Amino acid sequence: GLTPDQAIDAIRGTGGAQPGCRALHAKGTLYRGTFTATRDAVMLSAAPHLDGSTVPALIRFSNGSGNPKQRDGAPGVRGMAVKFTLPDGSTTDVSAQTARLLVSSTPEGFIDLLKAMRPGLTTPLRLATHLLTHPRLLGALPLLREANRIPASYATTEYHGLHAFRWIAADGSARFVRYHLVPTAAEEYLSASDARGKDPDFLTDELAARLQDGPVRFDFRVQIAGPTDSTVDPSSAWQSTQIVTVGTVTITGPDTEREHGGDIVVFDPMRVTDGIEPSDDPVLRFRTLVYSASVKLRTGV
Ligand code: HEM
Numbered sequence: 001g002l003t004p005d006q007a008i009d010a011i012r013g014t015g016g017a018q019p020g021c022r023a024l025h026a027k028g029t030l031y032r033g034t035f036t037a038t039r040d041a042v043m044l045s046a047a048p049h050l051d052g053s054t055v056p057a058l059i060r061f062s063n064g065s066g067n068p069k070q071r072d073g074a075p076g077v078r079g080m081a082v083k084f085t086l087p088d089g090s091t092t093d094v095s096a097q098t099a100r101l102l103v104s105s106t107p108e109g110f111i112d113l114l115k116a117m118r119p120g121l122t123t124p125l126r127l128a129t130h131l132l133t134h135p136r137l138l139g140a141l142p143l144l145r146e147a148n149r150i151p152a153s154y155a156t157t158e159y160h161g162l163h164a165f166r167w168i169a170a171d172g173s174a175r176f177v178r179y180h181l182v183p184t185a186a187e188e189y190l191s192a193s194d195a196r197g198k199d200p201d202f203l204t205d206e207l208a209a210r211l212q213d214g215p216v217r218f219d220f221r222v223q224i225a226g227p228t229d230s231t232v233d234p235s236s237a238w239q240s241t242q243i244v245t246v247g248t249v250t251i252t253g254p255d256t257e258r259e260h261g262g263d264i265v266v267f268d269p270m271r272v273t274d275g276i277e278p279s280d281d282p283v284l285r286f287r288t289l290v291y292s293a294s295v296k297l298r299t300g301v
Contacts, residue, residue, distance in 0.1 A: 010114035016066015028062025030255040037247035045167040046275035073198035081267035092273035096159035099147030102234035107286035150195035177222035
């Protein structure tokens with residue numbers, strides 16, 4: 001079958017798996033903040049960080065590329081990851097990127113795509129024999145484009161968790177939800193034109209400047225599964241419009257005490273907590289493993 005090593009191989013074949021870098025989302029910065037849920041969130045989940053208290057929040061804004069030197073101005077996926085610290089010291093992560101849905105419904109599908117995406121031999125050719133294997137992708141371009149827009153700022157675009165998570169409340173009630181991190185700032189993007197002229201790391205510079213002006217806010221929203229919404233296929237579009245705000249992440253500045261020495265920082269979608277369980281999503285379950293591989297490759301060097 002498919003192994004973590006293989007996943008890393010496909011990733012490396014796309015320019016990723018660089019030394020001392022995350023196999024993917026190599027380029028990214030850490031920020032400090034806090035999170036406070038709405039008064040009602042505790043009715044959806046019993047998770048400690050959702051009870052209404054304020055908890056520490058570590059955020060990483062990144063470019064999806066495995067290339068540490070990726071150009072902010074070039075097309076690509078951006079990722080927003082939040083690590084919540086619970087009262088007892090434990091932590092639970094929320095991982096999200098700019099795409100509305102996943103390009104594939106399975107890990108194999110995603111990996112097969114990262115291989116046929118490799119440069120050299122016949123790039124535009126093999127990156128087609130895939131379409132034949134995965135029809136679903138022929139109508140994707142529309143979403144793919146949206147997921148690669150060049151945001152004017154990491155603070156002016158929204159991120160999605162894609163996978164469905166089962167939220168259990170103290171009363172025993174449960175519901176499946178998909179995560180969405182929306183900005184309180186107006187969403188805003190740059191045309192390919194402007195994007196080209198921008199500094200390689202303009203996104204890092206603008207956000208540093210934005211925070212010196214004041215905090216940046218993102219509302220955490222959960223889209224609650226409708227009667228026919230798949231809880232196992234992150235590529236499947238959901239019909240439900242029952243989307244509610246359950247909290248806000250308030251980012252106040254760049255972090256400086258983290259990732260010094262043998263300190264490792266990894267946002268694992270599987271790092272849930274009491275009151276939150278993972279769905280039988282094959283992509284979500286495979287991630288934690290391929291991540292361990294990636295974390296290993298960068299721990300040593
Ligand atoms: C099955 C296919 C996937 C693979 C193989 C994969 C692999 C990776 C790898 C290797 C990293 C670097 C991990 C590290 O060293 O800590 C990463 C980071 C990340 N991935 Fe994925 N990923 C996949 C799917 C997804 C999906 C569907 C999402 C959407 C929510 C996602 C969101 C992220 C984010 C936000 C980061 C940033 C982590 C950070 O900044 O610390 N990934 N992924």
